Design a protein around this ligand. Sequence first.
Ligand SMILES: O=C(N[C@@H]1CNCCC[C@H]1OC(=O)c1cc(O)c(C(=O)c2c(O)cccc2C(=O)O)c(O)c1)c1ccc(O)cc1
Ligand SMILES: [Mg+2]
Lengths: 338, 61, 618
Amino acid sequence: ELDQLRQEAEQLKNQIRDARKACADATLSQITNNIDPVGRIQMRTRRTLRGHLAKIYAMHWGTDSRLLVSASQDGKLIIWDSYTTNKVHAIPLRSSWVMTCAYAPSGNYVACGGLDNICSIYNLKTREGNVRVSRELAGHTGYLSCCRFLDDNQIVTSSGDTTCALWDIETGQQTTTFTGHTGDVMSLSLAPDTRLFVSGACDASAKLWDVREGMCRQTFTGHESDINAICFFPNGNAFATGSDDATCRLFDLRADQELMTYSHDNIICGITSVSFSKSGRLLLAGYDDFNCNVWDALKADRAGVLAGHDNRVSCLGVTDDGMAVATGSWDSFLKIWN
Amino acid sequence: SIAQARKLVEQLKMEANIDRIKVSKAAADLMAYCEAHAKEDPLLTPVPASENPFREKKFFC
Amino acid sequence: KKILLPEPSIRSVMQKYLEDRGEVTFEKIFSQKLGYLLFRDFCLNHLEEARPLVEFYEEIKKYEKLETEEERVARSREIFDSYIMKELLAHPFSKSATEHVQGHLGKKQVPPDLFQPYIEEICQNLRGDVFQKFIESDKFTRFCQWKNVELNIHLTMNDFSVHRIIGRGGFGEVYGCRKADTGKMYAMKCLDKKRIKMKQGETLALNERIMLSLVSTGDCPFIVCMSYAFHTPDKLSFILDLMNGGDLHYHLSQHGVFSEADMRFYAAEIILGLEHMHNRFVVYRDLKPANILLDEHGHVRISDLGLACDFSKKKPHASVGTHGYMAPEVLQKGVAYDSSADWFSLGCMLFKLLRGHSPFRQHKTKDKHEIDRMTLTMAVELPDSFSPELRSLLEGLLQRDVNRRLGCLGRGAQEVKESPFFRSLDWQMVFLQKYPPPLIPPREEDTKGIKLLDSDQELYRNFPLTISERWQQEVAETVFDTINAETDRLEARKKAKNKQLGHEEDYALGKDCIMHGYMSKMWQRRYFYLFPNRLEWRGEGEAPQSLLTMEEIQSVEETQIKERKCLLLKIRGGKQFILQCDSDPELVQWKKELRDAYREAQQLVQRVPKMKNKPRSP
Ligand SMILES: O=C(N[C@@H]1CNCCC[C@H]1OC(=O)c1cc(O)c(C(=O)c2c(O)cccc2C(=O)O)c(O)c1)c1ccc(O)cc1
Ligand SMILES: [Mg+2]
């Protein structure tokens, strides 16, 4: 009876492999083989944001493409003005072990959390001006790895308890829970339409979740190690991942399989972050070797390298308006590039 | 458990029961997206120095 | 020259030092002079709910100290009339407790015990929320300022202003001196380290320090007590009670023999002194008049504690003492003994004050072995002039059989007290040093072939000591009142100054700071904050712009920098960070709380893939 279902457990897995090979008529690199290359992209560092006193673990742009939050080992969140270097707010946290952070699309709130196992929501403009905690989200029995807002009153978090969860910020409860991963969840990315979101984990698999219905539609394996970061393609029908194997991978949803692999033989360390340019032609990957690389997403060629950090690039992100890229590092500085 | 095994079989039937399009069509639609919006991407199509905040822009809102 | 208290921020370190040793309990603080004084300040001045309770406690204590029964009956009813009608209308007392008190009162019987039930019930109410409110208050902050000073006591000859010689010996000479810290009058006893090595007085000198320490607790008026002990590179040193009246052997030369009426006085105070030593399981073993001293008023104490001995864990069997005053069981080869011996010495000494020599000393002989042979064999022939109640006493003391001797049958000192000789005295009054005294006093290069090795110095490694209630009493009766006011002015002035500067509130509040305080980096003094994952620091002006993470720390060790103990952090990048501290409690706690900090930190990271160190090199 236990045996009886473990045969069908793999009879269906093989039904899926064969189901997918039927679609593998041609590869992306073949179709793209015709288009002009993007050519060398020599972005220079245009700002250095100095303030944090120790490692940066996570950053996040605001929707205005000017303000950005950054979490840090030093126990502070900072909100910077990229155009001038000015700090808008230096928020000191109630727990030193922060790992993630996030800016509301509205820009009225920010969030963070870590080994405290709580996603704390901060109100960036009180009825006076003082920045204060407006809610703590206790629930997970594991470290908070990442989190993103849908709107002011909803947030989605991932945790090392091997699960994700969608929150209702007012009541501070879990509307929906996302069980499925068999290892620590590490990152997530919202679809632009928001009805979906993808997640990545230490089981070397990523999963597309049906936000509203609350279940896993698809599971994309292929990676040989812990998927550390993940990112949606602007149209929302494909996403990229980064892993400790030293490769990025592009997965398409409608094709239901891996499309592309980005990996030079010289690149042997892990990937810590991923982000597409505004059109989606460029895939920027952050590496443990201090460099952010720039991939031609369609041709799988390395367009160029963002190199100017003295330690791991621990996070990155393009602005909405595509004007600039920001890299955050263990050297304690963020840097804006273009 | 048997609950744990039956959970998986129900899910793996749920993953097989999605329809799929051809990778040829999958790639062709992405390449359609990049080509299209390439004009508006400033990391590919740079804008005037004065209109870019991180180069020579002077006036701000 | 004068005591400067540390700043209030010391609390952060000290509280954690005390919490770890369980010394932050009502019963631990309350039973300390400085702890009590600060507590009662708070209750009286800064908490109306506690005021009557303490006021009432202090009133009961003054009643205990009343001399006689007729004074008590007065104060007894006097007390129940006033405060009790306020407290019974409040915080009521128990029926069970009032029953006993009112039972005695109804019969007009008034012991000190009378109010003991009300003491216990007061404490019940003082140790609950009233205590926790005290811990949160600035008077606990002030207790910690003082406690820091106590546990950081490092003494040298700079601290004392030495005056005149008042005694020679074998290894050194006793002086009279003032402590510049408080301006307290003391007697110094400096033993030369080059002399002690020349005489093999190694276990002997190290013994005295232990013996002085064991007797000095409890606040006794009849033994020359120690407050401190310390050493310099070439000398040992004791700080003992001052006595400017000379020894009883010198006065016996100038006064001749004393009368019974006068011998009683000395005997009483000497007895109560011995009682103190015996209840603390210490045998003195050399009671002679030369070891008894007089203060300027005339009263006596016991002094030379070199030959004394602990007998709790095992009983001694040596032949220790002066040859005229040793008990028979001391002189015998392997006969063990306890407090027994000091009673035989009392008889021998009390005889000499009446007749001018030891009863076993005869023809002014100077033959130790003959004198010892009188003790064991000769029955002591008592004079006829002697009173009957005196004969009763002495032959009780000089009885050879230990089972047949007074003060060894079970009740110890009490058997001698209740003797027929002391039938007139009220022993409480003796203790209170209230009876009038009979007498009031009127107004080298031999060790140059012997070097001091650093192996010999380690034998005195744990020599220095400071008796806690002694130092606390010293401060209490001198500089404690005036220094609190001065450091109160500073701490209000610094706050008033910071208010004009637009005071920024503590960087440590509202976060998860473990602890915080001053230290010096490398010297550069800076204020630190230890967080669970890092150790920040700032200069006097701005917030911390510099730090060191916990994962960077390989090991926290301790090492020397120009003969001062410091912490030696080893950073992962092959670098070293050195920290100095303003006091020893700080050194112990920083060392600990970092060792716990980085060890916790490094395990937490292990789990987290987002924070740990992954492979790079092929
Ligand atoms: O103890 C005092 N005086 C004593 C009285 N006994 C008679 C001898 C004089 C004097 O003793 C000393 O000055 C003295 C000095 C010493 O260095 C030593 C010792 O080194 C010593 C010792 O500490 C323990 C055992 C033996 C000896 C020794 O010298 O043989 C000593 O025993 C007495 C005394 C104590 C306090 C005070 O305020 C004033 C005086
Ligand atoms: Mg013996």
